[PDB]
């Protein structure tokens, strides 16, 4: 049989402790401000997330040209393939793959395909959470001009005014090594290339280029290579208020 009906009907859900979402086999949002795209809502507080995530393919002319943040609300967005022109604080971007874009609470984001072929973005948004003597700020570049440190990748500054940070992380495939963790903090990751096995609750699940997945506050995580890399949000630098 075709490898692909094997691995048909993943989507998995623990909620509170993790969900493995195939944002393909998903009905698509319709989000005012969003025009001619397809928006796939992954990540919510209904899920027990303290965010709100999204997958968006931009049809030409696609995008949000009515402004995505919000009131203490800050944004990140990055370029999975194709090319955008995002606008911000007054400037502008032009993003390629591996393109990102980071807006603190109030600034705005808007967002348009820049080519004729469709352009997919990865969308983020949270509540702000601002501590005595910091503030954050807009950051933009892509992935390609990062620090190479399997390889991490940090998207935004470590600063306390920063309260969450996007991350990579790539598997080559003669790896001999495999992704772990365990944490009070959530994750949301988005398989952006290869493919590998990941092992959320005690199961080993098949995962791939396009599958999303929540990791819940107080799980384990696991997974390797099988280049296999995906991106995922990290909230940071915060105490919990009660």
């Given at each position: ?97 591996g ?42 570049g892509?992935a390609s001009e990062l620090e190479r440190i399997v390889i991490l990748l940090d998207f935004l500054p470590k ?6 940070n996007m991350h990579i992380l790539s598997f080559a495939?003669?790896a001999?090594h495999?992704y772990?963790e ?45 280049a296999?890399s995906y991106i995922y949000?990290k909230?940071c ?6």
């Amino acid at each position: 049989g075709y490898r692909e009906d094997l691995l048909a009907n993943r989507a998995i859900v623990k909620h509170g402790n993790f969900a493995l979402l195939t944002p393909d086999g998903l009905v698509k949002n319709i989000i005012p401000g969003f025009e001619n795209c397809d928006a796939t809502i992954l990540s919510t507080p209904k899920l027990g997330a303290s965010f709100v995530d999204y997958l968006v393919t931009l049809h030409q002319n696609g995008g949000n040209q009515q402004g995505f943040g919000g009131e203490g609300i800050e944004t990140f967005l990055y370029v999975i393939s194709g090319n955008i022109t995002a606008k911000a604080e007054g400037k502008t971007f032009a993003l390629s793959e591996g393109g990102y874009l980071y807006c603190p609470p109030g600034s705005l984001m808007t967002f348009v395909n820049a080519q004729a072929e469709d352009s997919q973005i990865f969308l983020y948004k949270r509540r702000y959470v601002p501590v005595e003597g910091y503030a954050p700020w807009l950051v933009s570049g892509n992935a390609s001009e990062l620090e190479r440190i399997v390889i991490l990748l940090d998207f935004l500054p470590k600063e306390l005014g920063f309260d969450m940070n996007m991350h990579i992380l790539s598997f080559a495939p003669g790896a001999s090594h495999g992704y772990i963790e365990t944490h009070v903090q959530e994750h949301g990751a988005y398989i952006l290339s290869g493919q590998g096995v990941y092992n959320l609750d005690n199961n080993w699940i098949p995962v791939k280029k396009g599958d999303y997945i929540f990791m819940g506050a107080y799980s384990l995580q696991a997974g390797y290579g099988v280049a296999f890399s995906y991106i995922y949000s990290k909230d940071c630098n915060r105490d919990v208020e009660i």
